[PDB]
Amino acid sequence: GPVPSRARVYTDVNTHRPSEYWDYESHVVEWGNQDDYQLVRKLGRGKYSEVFEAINITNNEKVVVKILKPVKKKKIKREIKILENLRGGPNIITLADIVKDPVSRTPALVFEHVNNTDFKQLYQTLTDYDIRFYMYEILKALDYCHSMGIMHRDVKPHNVMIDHEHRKLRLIDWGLAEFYHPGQEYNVRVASRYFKGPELLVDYQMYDYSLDMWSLGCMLASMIFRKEPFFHGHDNYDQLVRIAKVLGTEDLYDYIDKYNIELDPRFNDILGRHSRKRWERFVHSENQHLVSPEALDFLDKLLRYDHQSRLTAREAMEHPYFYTVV
Amino acid sequence: GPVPSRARVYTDVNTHRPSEYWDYESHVVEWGNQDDYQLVRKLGRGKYSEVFEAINITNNEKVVVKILKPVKKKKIKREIKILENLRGGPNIITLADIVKDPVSRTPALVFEHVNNTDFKQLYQTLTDYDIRFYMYEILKALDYCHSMGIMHRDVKPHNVMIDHEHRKLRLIDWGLAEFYHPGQEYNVRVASRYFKGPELLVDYQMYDYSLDMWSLGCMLASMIFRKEPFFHGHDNYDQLVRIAKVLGTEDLYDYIDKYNIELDPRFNDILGRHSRKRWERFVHSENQHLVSPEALDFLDKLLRYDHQSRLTAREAMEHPYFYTV
Numbered sequence: 185g186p187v188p189s190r191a192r193v194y195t196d197v198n199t200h201r202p203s204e205y206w207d208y209e210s211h212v213v214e215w216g217n218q219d220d221y222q223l224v225r226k227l228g229r230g231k232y233s234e235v236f237e238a239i240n241i242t243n244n245e246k247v248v249v250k251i252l253k254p255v256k257k258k259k260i261k262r263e264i265k266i267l268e269n270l271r272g273g274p275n276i277i278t279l280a281d282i283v284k285d286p287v288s289r290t291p292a293l294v295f296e297h298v299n300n301t302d303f304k305q306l307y308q309t310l311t312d313y314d315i316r317f318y319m320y321e322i323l324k325a326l327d328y329c330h331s332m333g334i335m336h337r338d339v340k341p342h343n344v345m346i347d348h349e350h351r352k353l354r355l356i357d358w359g360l361a362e363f364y365h366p367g368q369e370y371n372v373r374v375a376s377r378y379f380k381g382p383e384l385l386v387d388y389q390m391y392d393y394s395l396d397m398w399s400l401g402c403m404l405a406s407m408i409f410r411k412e413p414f415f416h417g418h419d420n421y422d423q424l425v426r427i428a429k430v431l432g433t434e435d436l437y438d439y440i441d442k443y444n445i446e447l448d449p450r451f452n453d454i455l456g457r458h459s460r461k462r463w464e465r466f467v468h469s470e471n472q473h474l475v476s477p478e479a480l481d482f483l484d485k486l487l488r489y490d491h492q493s494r495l496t497a498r499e500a501m502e503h504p505y506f507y508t509v510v
Numbered sequence: 511g512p513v514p515s516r517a518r519v520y521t522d523v524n525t526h527r528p529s530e531y532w533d534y535e536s537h538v539v540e541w542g543n544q545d546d547y548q549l550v551r552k553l554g555r556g557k558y559s560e561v562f563e564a565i566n567i568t569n570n571e572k573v574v575v576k577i578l579k580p581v582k583k584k585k586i587k588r589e590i591k592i593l594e595n596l597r598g599g600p601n602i603i604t605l606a607d608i609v610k611d612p613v614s615r616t617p618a619l620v621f622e623h624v625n626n627t628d629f630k631q632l633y634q635t636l637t638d639y640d641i642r643f644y645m646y647e648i649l650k651a652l653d654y655c656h657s658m659g660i661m662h663r664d665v666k667p668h669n670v671m672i673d674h675e676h677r678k679l680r681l682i683d684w685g686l687a688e689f690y691h692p693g694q695e696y697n698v699r700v701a702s703r704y705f706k707g708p709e710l711l712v713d714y715q716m717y718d719y720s721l722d723m724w725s726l727g728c729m730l731a732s733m734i735f736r737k738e739p740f741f742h743g744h745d746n747y748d749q750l751v752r753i754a755k756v757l758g759t760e761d762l763y764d765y766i767d768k769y770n771i772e773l774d775p776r777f778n779d780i781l782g783r784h785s786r787k788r789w790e791r792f793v794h795s796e797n798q799h800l801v802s803p804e805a806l807d808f809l810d811k812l813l814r815y816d817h818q819s820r821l822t823a824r825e826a827m828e829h830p831y832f833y834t835v
């Protein structure tokens with residue numbers, strides 16, 4: 185069978201905590217009355233949910249309301265427990281209330297309001313500094329949640345809300361997040377296709393916080409290279425082929441051999457043979473103003489097949505790419 | 511109604527600053543992970559907090575962890591905003607971190623560590639110069655926080671930490687501190703009984719930074735006269751009577767008339783009639799080595815009913831009592 189693996193950081197943080205912290209199945213959720221909130225408008229379609237801007241009628245303050253499609257109660261309890269655990273952490277969306285509408289009884293989560301800037305227009309205005317600044321803000325959220333024994337497992341631009349005017353960033357949608365327990369075998373059907381780490385694609389279940397660092401590397405590459413998404417798979421098997429066209433097939437075999445991973449036969453006719461590309465090959469006139477030796481070195485240290493070799497969020501924060509940020 | 515009043519110094523310092531500075535209710539607090547700190551032992555206890563000795567495991571440095579009993583979230587936000595605004599100011603306790611334990615989720619504040627010398631231990635070995643030196647250190651903290659538009663509102667010896675060996679002083683516990691806005695009516699249920707200014711006791715809500723100068727006067731009187739506390743009230747109403755036994759009832763009526771203050775009927779049977787006492791009376795063989803004409807003149811200029819008449823922290827720093835520091 186496969187060789188076991190464990191996180192290089194925060195390995196035993198849940199092991200040394202009482203069961204109340206990580207046993208979400210035994211958590212008692214107190215559902216308040218949603219009558220204190222009036223829905224204003226739809227903001228997005230969540231992930232088995234719908235996100236709204238709303239007004240808290242008791243104080244005239246705007247809030248965000250996430251209405252959950254009750255597909256699995258265990259998953260709702262998980263997201264609530266994680267949100268309660270991380271409540272108030274740096275750059276984490278703040279859970280303010282848990283409510284149900286009296287007639288519908290639909291589970292709803294109430295959050296701190298975020299005034300989302302439309303980035304599809306300011307994507308061209310972004311500077312090298314802005315990318316370094318916001319990448320550091322995401323790293324503060326990840327080092328915090330990882331320290332709290334939680335893996336986000338769905339890091340992607342859609343789950344990062346930015347209020348550019350106030351330079352405020354929040355990591356949202358903790359619906360796929362899980363508690364990290366060393367040696368635990370997790371479901372690989374997590375994250376979004378373009379952001380899935382190689383561990384998920386080769387069905388290596390004993391992954392950790394490092395999965396979020398791969399996803400972060402995908403985001404960085406798409407931003408500095410203005411190539412969205414960076415690895416454009418058309419299905420989960422093709423996704424590994426898109427990564428192999430950049431990282432090469434030699435290092436992929438080294439990875440699968442290191443962990444004694446059995447490669448699915450579906451890869452047989454599609455994987456091929458690919459050279460390891462230089463990161464400099466992706467620089468062009470439209471993106472050269474966001475690229476630097478520091479940025480390419482940092483990206484190279486995140487986008488590694490081997491989940492154990494990737495920088496942790498704390499190591500990433502010490503990289504020279506961030507020497508110019510506060 | 512009562513006659514309005516405003517501070518003689520730093521009146522408009524908050525008016526000329528954006529709302530982000532003084533609007534603590536809109537401040538976003540980032541609660542870090544307390545796992546970076548290991549609690550060693552309990553140091554001190556407060557009315558709504560507990561102070562523990564701790565170690566920061568990431569750098570092996572001792573810190574102080576103040577664990578807050580979450581009675582009111584608005585008050586926690588206020589103390590944090592004020593500590594962030596004054597962070598690094600002279601003789602102000604330094605907020606190092608804001609954390610919560612993963613399982614308890616109890617708000618905790620992380621401060622610099624102070625090797626506190628006991629208040630009763632140094633008491634007998636204190637010189638006239640030591641009192642002048644440390645009073646000047648408190649004044650640096652007050653003139654600074656007042657300049658930053660903040661009233662401490664709980665000045666007392668328990669909130670002053672001193673490392674005598676290193677001649678280091680810190681003004682602590684900003685849990686009752688508030689932002690000064692000219693014309694604002696504040697809650698009078700602040701400070702500790704013995705240190706409450708007359709304005710609080712007569713329910714005059716439009717007070718300012720001068721409240722801290724009354725409290726400082728109470729501290730200096732207890733030190734130079736070796737009489738702890740100086741105004742020993744047994745309740746908030748009796749506290750005004752104890753001040754009246756020293757300052758006299760004539761000047762108390764002049765004060766309440768000047769500001770058109772309605773005196774609570776609870777004062778009717780207890781206030782009585784009292785002469786204005788001379789400060790020289792409180793001098794005795796056990797305290798004469800810490801008393802001087804300069805000290806009495808300075809004290810007389812702090813312990814005044816009229817909050818507008820008391821010396822400001824800046825004026826106090828220019829007093830002849832400090833010419834030797």
Ligand SMILES: CCc1ccccc1-c1ccc(CNCCc2nc3cccc(C)c3[nH]2)cc1Cl
Nearest residue numbers: 227228300303318341342343344345403404407
């Ligand atoms: C300069 C930041 C950056 C650096 C590097 C790579 C990507 C990005 C980046 C680029 C754009 C965004 C903004 N994404 C918004 C996501 C989002 N809007 C919503 C509106 C309504 C509802 C939801 C769920 C929403 N969800 C976030 C990020 Cl983190």
Ligand SMILES: CCc1ccccc1-c1ccc(CNCCc2nc3cccc(C)c3[nH]2)cc1Cl
Nearest residue numbers: 553554561626629644667668670729730732733
């Ligand atoms: C009469 C006050 C006075 C007038 C003039 C000059 C100095 C002082 C003075 C001011 C402060 C102290 C020392 N107070 C210690 C306070 C204190 N320790 C703590 C230890 C643990 C926890 C807490 C909250 C603590 N809180 C002693 C003195 Cl002598």
